[PDB]
């Protein structure tokens, strides 16, 4: 048996692909042929299967609304079609026979070659890196707690601000702004918040903590396109 | 100012959707709406905005493909749509009001309330996790090494089987199955590749290491829906 798969694609965000799959050797409608997905930099996915004629499709919860198969019965060629494609389902996509109609035999032992499908979207190309430390402050109400933010790149902007911001995110609640543009205090934020940093350097410090103050806090950067948050930090109780 | 969205949407996925945001208390024209997506035990991400009026865009490489923004510059509401859902796009969403037209303040200052999307997957109960060990494993070439991977479930289908399969990844190459259902070895590979296991425990055993067996190793299974893989073992050499 032999799976030949189709060639690479160059793809534009938001097109839709349908990746074909060749099986020769063995009778095609008997068993079913798996897609199997990889990342760069990742595992092995399995996203779902097909078993051509015997209408009969299996997928992986996670690659619903994504991956659709059908099967040409007749050359006997196996498609997965990958819709609104986003920088994401950039990987490597495998078909390779599987499972067997009556359901004993169930290995994935022939595979094609795959079929490499690269979406254009400029993969995040030189986004502005913010490393917040600690990402776990515990403390204890009456603390005072510092958060640092630093940035890959200066953010100066040549108009003569530096666009970081600070956000506190408590679950149920939008993004509540603390300080922007480093150090000024957005209003309605008691005076225990404070912010002062230049360039990459960034500090967030909190006098004294209180209970309504305990969640996760971002810092953000809005010189550079495009706009980047910080990883995260819980500040949370000792 | 109030940025208002609208109410939680239970999706299919593949179902489409837009969700807007009602803007008051300003110049609807003279700050670029922004989106923000708050997944589930992930951090805050920015998924671009608009500018009412031009409609100018700009979107974060990662959402192109899957966000389109729109806005009613007769209404005064913002509007964004996601493509094809998948349940990566089950978060909570948000419109901030951002960038000014003249482009001196860029702050998220006032944020609607969040719109949370729950994209249906369904569930398959608890997917089999395989967790490998060692992840990493340095040796000389002709020393023996081991690998083993535990189940969270026992892999004994009732029809007696014991799908537990082992695959070799080699890059610019597709999975190289050795051993199946256990301790079968796959035609062709030699017998130097060993394996055996029982319940949960399941081990693969390479007597002799051969530089050809230099890779990452993944073992998977069939025996419980949805076929899951292991995370991944490193033979490298010393």
């Known amino acids: 048996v032999q799976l030949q798969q189709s060639g690479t694609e160059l793809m534009k965000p938001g097109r839709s692909l349908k990746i074909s799959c060749?099986?020769?050797?063995?009778?095609?409608?008997?068993?079913?042929?798996?897609?199997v997905k990889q990342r760069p930099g990742h595992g092995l996915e399995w996203?779902?299967?097909?078993?051509?004629?015997?209408?009969?499709?299996?997928?992986?919860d996670k690659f619903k609304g994504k991956a659709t198969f059908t099967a040409d019965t007749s050359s006997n060629i196996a498609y997965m079609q990958l819709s609104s494609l986003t920088s994401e389902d950039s990987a490597v996509?495998?078909?390779?026979?599987?499972?067997?109609?009556?359901?004993?035999?169930?290995?994935?032992?022939?595979?094609?070659?795959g079929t490499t499908v690269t979406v254009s979207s400029g993969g995040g190309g030189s986004d502005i890196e913010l490393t917040q430390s600690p990402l776990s402050l515990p403390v204890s109400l009456g603390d005072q707690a510092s958060i640092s933010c630093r940035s890959s790149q200066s953010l100066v902007h040549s108009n003569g601000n530096t666009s970081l911001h600070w956000y506190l995110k408590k679950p149920g609640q939008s993004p509540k702004l603390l300080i922007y543009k480093v150090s000024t205090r957005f209003s309605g934020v008691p005076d225990r918040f404070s912010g002062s940093g230049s360039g990459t350097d960034f500090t967030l410090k909190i006098s004294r903590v209180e209970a309504e103050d305990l969640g996760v806090y971002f810092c953000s950067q809005s010189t550079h396109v495009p706009f980047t948050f910080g990883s995260g930090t819980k500040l949370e109780l000792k | 100012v109030q940025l208002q969205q609208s109410g939680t949407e239970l999706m299919k996925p593949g179902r489409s959707l837009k969700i807007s945001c009602k803007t008051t208390?300003?110049?609807?024209?003279?700050?670029?709406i922004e989106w923000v997506k708050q997944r589930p035990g992930h951090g805050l991400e920015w998924i671009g905005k608009?500018?009412?009026?031009?409609?100018?865009?700009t979107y974060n490489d990662k959402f192109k493909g899957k966000a389109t923004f729109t806005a009613d510059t007769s209404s005064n509401i913002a509007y964004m749509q996601l493509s094809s859902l998948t349940s990566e796009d089950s978060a909570v969403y948000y419109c901030?009001?951002?960038?000014?037209?003249?482009?001196?303040?860029?702050?998220?200052?006032?944020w609607g309330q969040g719109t949370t999307v729950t994209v249906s997957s369904g569930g398959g109960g608890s997917d089999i996790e395989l967790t490998q060990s060692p992840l990493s494993l340095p040796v000389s070439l002709g020393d023996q090494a081991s690998i083993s991977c535990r189940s969270s479930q026992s892999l004994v289908h009732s029809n007696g089987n014991t799908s537990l399969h082992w695959y070799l990844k080699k890059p610019g190459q597709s999975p190289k199955l050795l051993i199946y259902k256990v301790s079968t070895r796959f035609s062709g590979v030699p017998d130097r590749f060993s394996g055996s296991g029982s319940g949960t425990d399941f081990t693969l055993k390479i007597s002799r290491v051969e530089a050809e067996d230099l890779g990452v190793y993944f073992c998977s299974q069939s025996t419980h829906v949805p076929f899951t893989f292991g995370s991944g073992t490193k033979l490298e050499l010393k």
């Open positions: 208390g300003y110049i609807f024209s003279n700050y670029w």
């Open positions: 608009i500018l009412p009026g031009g409609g100018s865009n």
């Open positions: 901030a009001r951002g960038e000014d037209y003249y482009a001196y303040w860029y702050v998220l200052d006032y």
